[PDB]
Ligand binder design. Structure first.
Ligand SMILES: CCCCCN(C)CCC(O)(P(=O)(O)O)P(=O)(O)O
Ligand SMILES: [Mg+2]
Ligand SMILES: [Mg+2]
Ligand SMILES: [Mg+2]
Length: 508
């Protein structure tokens, strides 16, 4: 990554009329007659190509009327149709019971019938649908285990390279857990080779992708300029994480109309990865204690006591925090500086508890560690910032409620932390080793336990999305998509993902 070259991008196309024509056509298709299984497959194709943000209402209405049609003959007895309907309806907020899978099980033992290994597409759809489940839905747990076992069994026996690629991709990460934009870039190429491929939808996908990528490149140019202006790229003992943070933010939100929010999120992310290193890599406890005190008091009057290599990240945090709070004051009429200050103070207190534990040789339980680490991962900061920047009529009360980390937000933060600990030269007190110290458990027993925690908290997020809350569409999607971006990173192979998504356009 030549940041010299990324300041280039965004400085330097009219396909927008054809884009609007293709959008009207795809929209008519979504409203079109569409025998119901074909309509489901089309809606799911539109989603996988990253186009749901264009056709929100049409997709919702189409799925709502599919749910309310008078007859079930078109999907019952059909595993692919049953699973796809389950998943899409339950993604749309329309509950479907797990009972619909019982007719594919041996009615005595509850096991899915081994003969289903003859239906690869149905197995894939059952697999994908299983990750829409909640706690206590045992049929969906069984569906996950069975489908994964069978798919890995037959992956070597599949001779269609396209379907082998799809099966391998699903085994890497289920669709429910995948970052939308990167998955869209992958599935454009995949969809171009599918059986019932619709060329109108494919062309619109490619064109819309290039346009959104143009917005992204302008954003990257501005952010690289700012980041060089901070001088933080030239820190020897701190990660140069501007482009990594922007990739995180793309996973969190990719819509062009949210661009400015992205930039701020990106900024915060960068600073997070810098300050963490200040706390994890190169910093005296006296230096970090002073860092934390200054941040808690929001008072930079004694900042010159710090060496300039620490003084620059601290003051960049300070000034960017004030800038974002003032953006809130100006554009939303609400001074957000106290809340950016609060979230940074809380995150530095979490960093401080972690560093103090290390120096003390403390070995916390997994629960204690996680209580601190859902904050130290930084996503309370990022999510409260996104809420500040996007909520209608911001108030002290709304901000206090979101910053209290209710179950929905707290589950997303926990997931980000434990996913990063599964993906992880620093502080070796992470999730796995905390559990090992707790229970004396094995390396791999602890790892599988943490993976089970991943599944459990995803179940809780799924059930949260069905339950009333004072949160609305954009923040909802933010909360899910930070977990998806975490899955994206801690599965450089991430570098070439950035090249394919943010740098190179799609040839048309
Ligand atoms: C974009 C904001 C999240 C990016 C990841 N941050 C660096 C978190 C820091 C960590 O996760 P990292 O593993 O050091 O990257 P930590 O485990 O030290 O808390
Ligand atoms: Mg770290
Ligand atoms: Mg750390
Ligand atoms: Mg770490």
């Amino acid at each position: 990554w030549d940041y010299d070259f990324l300041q280039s991008l965004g400085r330097h196309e009219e396909h927008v009329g054809l884009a609007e024509k293709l959008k009207g056509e795809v929209k008519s298709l979504i409203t079109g007659p569409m025998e119901p299984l074909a309509k489901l497959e089309f809606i799911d194709s539109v989603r996988r190509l990253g186009l749901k943000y264009q056709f929100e209402t049409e997709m919702k209405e189409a799925l709502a009327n599919i749910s309310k049609d008078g007859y079930d003959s078109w999907w019952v007895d059909n595993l692919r149709a049953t699973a796809l309907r389950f998943r899409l309806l339950r993604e749309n907020g329309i509950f479907v019971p797990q009972d619909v899978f019982e007719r594919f099980q041996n009615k005595e033992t509850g096991k899915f019938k081994n003969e289903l290994c003859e239906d690869v597409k149905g197995l894939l759809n059952l697999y994908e649908a299983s990750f829409l489940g909640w706690e206590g839905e045992d049929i969906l747990d069984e569906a996950r285990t069975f489908s994964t076992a069978q798919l890995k069994n037959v992956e070597g026996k599949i001779s269609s390279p396209n379907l082998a690629k799809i099966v391998h991709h699903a085994l890497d990460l289920p669709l429910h857990w995948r970052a939308i934009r990167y998955e869209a870039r992958w599935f454009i190429d995949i969809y171009e080779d599918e059986e019932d491929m619709n060329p109108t939808l494919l062309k619109y996908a490619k064109l819309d992708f290039n346009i959104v990528q143009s917005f992204h490149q302008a954003e990257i140019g501005r952010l690289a300029r700012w980041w060089v202006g901070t001088g933080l790229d030239k820190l020897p003992f701190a990660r140069n994480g501007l482009i990594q943070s922007y990739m995180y933010a793309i996973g969190m939100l990719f819509e062009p109309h949210l661009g400015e929010v992205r930039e701020m999120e990106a900024k915060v992310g960068a600073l997070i990865t810098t300050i963490d290193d200040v706390y994890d890599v190169y910093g005296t406890m006296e230096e970090l204690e002073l860092f934390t005190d200054i941040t808690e008091r929001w008072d930079i009057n004694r900042v010159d006591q710090l060496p300039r290599n620490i003084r620059m990240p601290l003051l960049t945090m300070f000034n960017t925090s004030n800038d974002i709070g003032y953006w809130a004051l100006k554009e939303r009429g609400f001074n957000g500086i106290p809340y950016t200050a609060k979230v940074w103070a809380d995150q530095l207190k979490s960093y401080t508890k972690e560093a103090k534990w290390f120096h003390e040789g403390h070995k916390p339980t997994l629960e204690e560690y996680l209580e601190n680490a859902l904050v130290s991962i930084g996503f309370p900061n990022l999510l409260v910032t996104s809420y500040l920047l996007t909520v209608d009529n911001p108030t002290k009360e709304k901000l206090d409620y979101v910053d209290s980390l209710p179950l929905f937000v707290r589950a997303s933060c926990i997931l980000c932390r434990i996913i990063n600990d599964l993906g992880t030269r620093g502080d070796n007190l992470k999730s796995i080793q905390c559990y090992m110290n707790e229970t004396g458990a094995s390396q791999e027993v602890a790892r599988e336990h943490i993976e089970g925690l991943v599944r459990m908290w995803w179940k809780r997020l799924n059930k949260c999305l069905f339950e009333p809350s004072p949160f609305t569409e954009p923040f909802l999607s933010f909360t899910i998509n930070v977990v998806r971006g975490s899955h994206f990173f801690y599965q450089s192979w991430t570098k070439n993902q950035g090249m394919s998504v943010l740098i190179h356009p799609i040839t048309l």
